[PDB]
Design a protein around this nucleic acid. Sequence first.
RNA 1: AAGAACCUUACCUGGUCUUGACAUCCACGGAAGUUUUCAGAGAUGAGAAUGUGCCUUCGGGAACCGUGAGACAGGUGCUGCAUGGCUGUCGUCAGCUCGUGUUGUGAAAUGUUGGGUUAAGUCCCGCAACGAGCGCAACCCUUAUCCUUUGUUGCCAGCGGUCCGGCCGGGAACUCAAAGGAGACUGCCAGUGAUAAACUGGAGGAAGGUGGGGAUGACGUCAAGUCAUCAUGGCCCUUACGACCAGGGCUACACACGUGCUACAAUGGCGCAUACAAAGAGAAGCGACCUCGCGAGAGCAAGCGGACCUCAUAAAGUGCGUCGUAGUCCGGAUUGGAGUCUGCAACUCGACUCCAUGAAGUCGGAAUCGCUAGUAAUCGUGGAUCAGAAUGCCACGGUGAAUAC
Lengths: 80, 98, 100, 206, 151, 127
Amino acid sequence: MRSLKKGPFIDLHLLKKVEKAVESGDKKPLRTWSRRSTIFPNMIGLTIAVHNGRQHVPVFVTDEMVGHKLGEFAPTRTYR
Amino acid sequence: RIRIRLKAFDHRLIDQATAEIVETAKRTGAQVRGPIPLPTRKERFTVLISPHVNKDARDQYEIRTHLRLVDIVEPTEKTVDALMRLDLAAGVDVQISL
Amino acid sequence: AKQSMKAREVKRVALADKYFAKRAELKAIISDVNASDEDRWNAVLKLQTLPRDSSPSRQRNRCRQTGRPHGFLRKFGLSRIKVREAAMRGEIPGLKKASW
Amino acid sequence: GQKVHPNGIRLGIVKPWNSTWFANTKEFADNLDSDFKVRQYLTKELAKASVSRIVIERPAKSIRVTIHTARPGIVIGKKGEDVEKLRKVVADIAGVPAQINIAEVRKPELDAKLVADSITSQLERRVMFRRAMKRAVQNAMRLGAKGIKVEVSGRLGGAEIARTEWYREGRVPLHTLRADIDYNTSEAHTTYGVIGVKVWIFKGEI
Amino acid sequence: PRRRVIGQRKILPDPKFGSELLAKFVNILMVDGKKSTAESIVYSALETLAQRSGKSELEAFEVALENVRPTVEVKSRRVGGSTYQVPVEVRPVRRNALAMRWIVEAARKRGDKSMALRLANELSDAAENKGTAVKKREDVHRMAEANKAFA
Amino acid sequence: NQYYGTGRRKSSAARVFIKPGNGKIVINQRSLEQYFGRETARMVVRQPLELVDMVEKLDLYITVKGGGISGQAGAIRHGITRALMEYDESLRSELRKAGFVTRDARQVERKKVGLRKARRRPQFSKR
RNA sequence: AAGAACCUUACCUGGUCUUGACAUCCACGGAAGUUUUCAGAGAUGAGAAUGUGCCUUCGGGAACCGUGAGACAGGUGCUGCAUGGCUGUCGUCAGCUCGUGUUGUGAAAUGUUGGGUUAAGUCCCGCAACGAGCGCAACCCUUAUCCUUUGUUGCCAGCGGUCCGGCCGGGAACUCAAAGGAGACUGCCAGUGAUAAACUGGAGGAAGGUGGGGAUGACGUCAAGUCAUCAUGGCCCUUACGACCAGGGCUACACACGUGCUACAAUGGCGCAUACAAAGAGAAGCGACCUCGCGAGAGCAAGCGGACCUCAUAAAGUGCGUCGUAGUCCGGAUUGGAGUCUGCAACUCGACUCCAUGAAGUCGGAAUCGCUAGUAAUCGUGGAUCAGAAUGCCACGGUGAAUAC
Ligand SMILES: [Mg+2]
Ligand SMILES: [Mg+2]
Ligand SMILES: [Mg+2]
Ligand SMILES: [Mg+2]
Ligand SMILES: [Mg+2]
Ligand SMILES: [Mg+2]
Ligand SMILES: [Mg+2]
Ligand SMILES: [Mg+2]
Ligand SMILES: [Mg+2]
Ligand SMILES: [Mg+2]
Ligand SMILES: [Mg+2]
Ligand SMILES: [Mg+2]
Ligand SMILES: [Mg+2]
Ligand SMILES: [Mg+2]
């Protein structure tokens, strides 16, 4: 999926989960363990929560964050 | 018109099979090309010697694959009948192409 | 080597010949320039529904006598130490000491 | 530590191979596996038959296992009522049709595996190892041999610290490649630990 | 070494002049084991040496060498709290192969453009008894007189 | 009709045929000047011939296989001396007096386990 | 560790299971197997349609599941200072010992010291020592030359036809392939030597003094390393320290050390054109040809489990042109953007390609390493591991030194 010939990637569990959310709009933050999935423009305005390894941190979506994969916005290792 | 190539892991054993095959061909009466030695293949391996560190100490192995070819030219109807399962040797590959 | 891990390898073998010898079209057939509608998008989506055990990506290829993960040798199927223990004794035919 | 397998450096010089079959790179790792599965069972099934050497060959998809022993009557029994029971499970283990024939070793005290077998059975039965390994050296030599060396290491006699003790009598040249030396090893799982046994027997020089 | 005395190897002569002395010169000048470019420089600087001054190409070499061969060099031996450099005469076989090393090394510090131009300039300087190679030869000679009280 | 020599210097085996006539040399269906180019590769071929001064007397047909530049050029020098060995007999003592007859058996040696290149160990630091 | 994105993973977080993920038993009921649906991050949980392998057990045993209870399974958990097995090392150094005899009250000694010589307790002569074993050497592999046998998928000296491509008939000579032999032994000569071992040279020879390399590592030392290749004595957890799964970490960074690659340029950079290798690999593999794309690569797609088919155009070099000593047409890090291929999945954390940017670096303090000949130096190709991923490891060849008083 890291090629235009294949197409942008999102997991099936996340894809069906976000579809239900937009059917009713913004709601309680979405907890997900998926970090390998790109960010689609269908979930702009949500506060999905990615799991960095120990906790779920809420990442706020924005038009700018529409080509970056989900895990980019959860620092997995702490430092100072 | 039929090629018999023989592969083995030791030259002395491969000679036992190629020697009878010309004898059988001579027993057919004449017209054998004579075994020809193709180049030998040798795979060399290098495995570590210890269960642990001391990487610098290794053992080097090698397996050879000796080759022969007799190139039977005249296919008598009694040549084909008699050239099955008469190698009298275990561990020697046989391959016949028509 | 830790019989638990040995049981994983044959569980991943069983699910490797079960699916990815027949369910390979999604990743091979429906990947190229053809009908570009959602059927390809279905193929990408449907490939994840199969269990995580894919054919190549999850086979550690460990030794056959001890299950040692490292030092494997594809030709003999044993580790680098069992090869010298299935040894120069004579277990492996035609394998002697090399000196060139 | 600093010595090579005497039976191994002489694989192509004087000592023969214990497995003589051919297979290309595709059918090697599984031919080897079925070899190990046959050897593992035959040693376990013939534990008290004093089996010396098992040589396996595969002529044309038909395994042929030849067992060398100094007690052939125990193996086959009364007109081969047990050898077939052994053959009937080798095919199961290997997946190919088998033919097991037996060769008698008429020198039970002059085989490396047999000697190292007898003096590790004794240790498990708790005889003092000095008596055990002094016997094997004399029994082999009075039976005709140009040299023998027996080595026993481990927690000998229950001592808290390990120790190695080797008795060499005669003439045993290890560097001379042409020498016909028989070497083998065994173990003893005593109530104190593990004891290792080695034995070199030098019989000929050509 | 300490046990086995041994002779020297045989050197193939150069392809343009057939002199072994210049056959060693292409060997000393060569780096990375590429005689092809090593010999390309030598003849290029040898040709422009003949036309600039002197006669021939194998003769302007031998005149230059006469002004860079050291007669006496100092070898150091350790005695006590310091070392004394005791002079000793140099055998001819070492003398030739030593002057050439000085010539090349001094001609690698020249400010000219390419090695072809540097080598010829230094060789012409040697025949005129000037340069940096003859600078070293005088110094090795001078050190002998300074320590000739330690002979 | 023809006389022959092999030459086998450093993994390059040649084969030379010596024909009485004028002086012309063809090697591997090419002229001597254009095949080698190196001044140390077109005189080392000539070295056996100039020593006996035949040079302009012999017509040479040559095929060389394997090796490199100086390996092949050295191999030819061996074969030519072996070719001259055949159709004249009293010439051995002088030809051997300048080499050209010794095979010069110096090949590339193994890499060796534990050694970085073939004899060079890796840098050894005590601490 | 001959190759951590998931896996490996043995670690952490979270979610779960218990005679269990792995093996032998007892009883109960079901042929197994197949497709699909729902909930879940996933293990799993709830299903819905699909099914029959020998008979004298046919009413149950033998293959495969679900369940129960108990025997037990399981541990990469501790002790390498309880062990086996396997290694490093002094050390490829020439030494380490024994039987009988003799000397000494005795621990011990002599043999093994002494004159030469040797790479070597190698060899000769002396000698209260006489012999023997483990070591040295030799037997072994490869390389250097010649002879005999065979001639494909290798070869082309001499013949004919050539789209001068071994291309085609055709030949067994040649290079080569692989089987078997010949050769090198201080064999011969002169001199020195205690007339001896041997040494220095001379001839012939492809090879001259163990021709070059490899394999081979004595008695033992460091109670050296490994309980995490494996096995094993004890000790311990055994609804747990066992087992399953999703995500993360093993790639973190004020610093320090080790082994390497790239350079700091003119015996070089770039552009065009063009010679010469060896060894090795290949079946969910190597992948020509042609087309497409600036390129990584994509498409159709022959050939080959192989002296023929693919990898695969070798590079340093040579000929021509430019750059004229500049942080430069040297250097290629770092960074922004655009992509390709494996792979469920490329953010943490892959390789590679296109455009732009252009850092430190202008020969490196004390100190310190390797190398004696096809060696160092320098240039490229291959293989193992491997879906993808080496400047490391292992192996091959091309060019090819200086110096040893
Ligand atoms: Mg091959
Ligand atoms: Mg993998
Ligand atoms: Mg060893
Ligand atoms: Mg090299
Ligand atoms: Mg220890
Ligand atoms: Mg310790
Ligand atoms: Mg420790
Ligand atoms: Mg003593
Ligand atoms: Mg000795
Ligand atoms: Mg030896
Ligand atoms: Mg996991
Ligand atoms: Mg690490
Ligand atoms: Mg600067
Ligand atoms: Mg790879």
